[PDB]
Amino acid sequence: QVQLVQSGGGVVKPGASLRLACSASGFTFTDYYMSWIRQTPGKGLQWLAYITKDGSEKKYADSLQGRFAVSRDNANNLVFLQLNTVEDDDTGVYYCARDDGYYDRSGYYGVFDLWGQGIRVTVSSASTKGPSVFPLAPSSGTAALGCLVKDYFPEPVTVSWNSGALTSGVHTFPAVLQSSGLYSLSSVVTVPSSSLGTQTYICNVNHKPSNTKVDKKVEPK
Amino acid sequence: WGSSGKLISTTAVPW
Amino acid sequence: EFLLTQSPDSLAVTLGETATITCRSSRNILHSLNNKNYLAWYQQRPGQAPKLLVIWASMRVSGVADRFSGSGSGTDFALTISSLQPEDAAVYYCQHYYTTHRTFGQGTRVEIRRTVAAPSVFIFPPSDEQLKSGTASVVCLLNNFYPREAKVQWKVDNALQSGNSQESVTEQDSKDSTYSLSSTLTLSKADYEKHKVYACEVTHQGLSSPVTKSFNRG
């Protein structure tokens, strides 16, 4: 199967360094240039670096001021990106991509025809912390209820309802980053108001970075 | 002339 | 040096109709040696990596639906999606490869157009559990509305709040093409206990006048 599987990444303190890895399968790795591309809220989709087939030549986006270093290991079908002296602008999702193109004496001209799944890079001095889970109780037609998943770090959390049995009407929202450096997320569901005395509603929260699993029963107040 | 892959290289020139 | 600017920033398209996205380059990227434009297009769906659609401005790559067509020359380019399908709701990016320092446009978000739908609005007081910890979060839910543009204002004893709330919005729903929005007002327990009425006021194209949901602390 033709694919690029990424690893590494995660949380890095401002000023420190972080390594990203990508593992290629299903094609002749040494026939290809490889590139890294990130997506950040402030700078959009941004090509960062490419490395030639034999790993000898590297090119970088000038705005990185030389802070990033791409390398490859052709004996093991790996390519790497090292982020150094990281800063808040470096937070985002980083992709490896296969680079298909041509080169003449003037340069290399190409496109990105196969992409890894992306890896989250979070630049933060915050410590890993599991969430508090608070009920959003139904008010007392249609009722709304939910769970507030507050003060965790890093992303992501997942939320299910009734161990995955309840999906209709569920909305789990994008998390927000609070000024404390911790994230907060809500998950809601709308249900028949008539079910509130007879149906149990449990939100199942999983924060893998902290190995925290919590189930919270949500009842009328 | 060098090629990384073939999608772009084989279509960069009419001939 | 080479700047790509897409327009519009976002586009709502009725299913089965035609979407047109444009990409302008600040510099010519047609090379006379091979008469090719060094321009590519990508599609990015939520939670996924971008996917290559088109190379050389107008050549679809393998597997790409033929309802996508790239056009243009020199400095002005377009991606046209005929007979738009639900899977075509995505962010589209152009990319030049005229130099060794490639850049992308800023992306154009294509959403499905549907009829106007007013939000259902709900407000949630802080839980007793949270309050025991020293903080109060008040949550306002706007459920299943269209178009995406909505305004939520927090009012505390009728006083308009600023700077102490955060919100986020779901991806467009695959079933009914609506959006939902969550907003959280956060105060210290002490500040929370200094006031009585907590309200979120919602303004939206589907409401003939703003809708307010509120509760009295207690």
Residue numbers in the entry:
A (entry chain H): 1 to 52, 52A, 53 to 82, 82A, 82B, 82C, 83 to 100, 100A, ...
B (entry chain E): 596 to 610
C (entry chain L): 1 to 27, 27A, 27B, 27C, 27D, 27E, 27F, 28 to 212
What's the publication's text?
The principal target of these antibodies is the primary immunodominant region (PID) on the gp41 fusion protein. The PID is an amphipathic 15-amino-acid region that separates the two heptad-repeat domains found in the post-fusion conformation of gp41. Cluster I anti-gp41 antibodies, including patient-derived 3D6, 7B2, and F240, bind to the HIV-1 PID region (HXB2 isolate residues: 596–610). 3D6 has a near-germline configuration, and F240 and 7B2 represent anti-PID antibodies that have undergone affinity maturation.
The HIV-1 gp41 PID peptide in the context of Fab F240 adopts a β-strand-loop-helix motif. The PID β-strand-loop-helix conformation is stabilized by intramolecular van der Waals interactions between the indole ring of W596 and the hydroxyl group of S604. In addition, the side chain of W596 packs into a hydrophobic pocket generated by A608 and V609, shielding these hydrophobic residues from the bulk solvent. In the case of the F240-bound PID peptide, the cysteine residues were mutated to serines; a 2.6-Å hydrogen bond between C598S and C604S recapitulates the disulfide bond that would naturally exist in the PID region. These intramolecular interactions stabilize a compact structure of the HIV-1 gp41 PID epitope that interacts at the heavy and light chain interface. The interactions of PID with Fab F240 can be partitioned in half with the N-terminal PID β-strand (residues 596–601) interacting primarily with the heavy chain, and the C-terminal PID α-helix (residues 602–610) forming interactions with the light chain. Overall, the PID buries 397 Å2 and 246 Å2 of surface area on the heavy and light chains, respectively. All six CDRs (CDR-H1, CDR-H2, CDR-H3, CDR-L1, CDR-L2, and CDR-L3) contact the PID. Specifically, the PID β-strand interacts with the heavy chain CDR-H1 and CDR-H3 through the formation of an intermolecular β-sheet with a β-finger structural motif located in the CDR-H3. The majority of interactions are hydrogen bonds between main-chain carbonyl oxygen or amide nitrogen atoms of both the PID peptide and Fab F240, with the exception of side-chain hydrogen bonds from K52A and D96 to PID. The PID α-helix interacts with the light chain CDR-L1 and CDR-L2 through van der Waals forces and six hydrogen bonds.
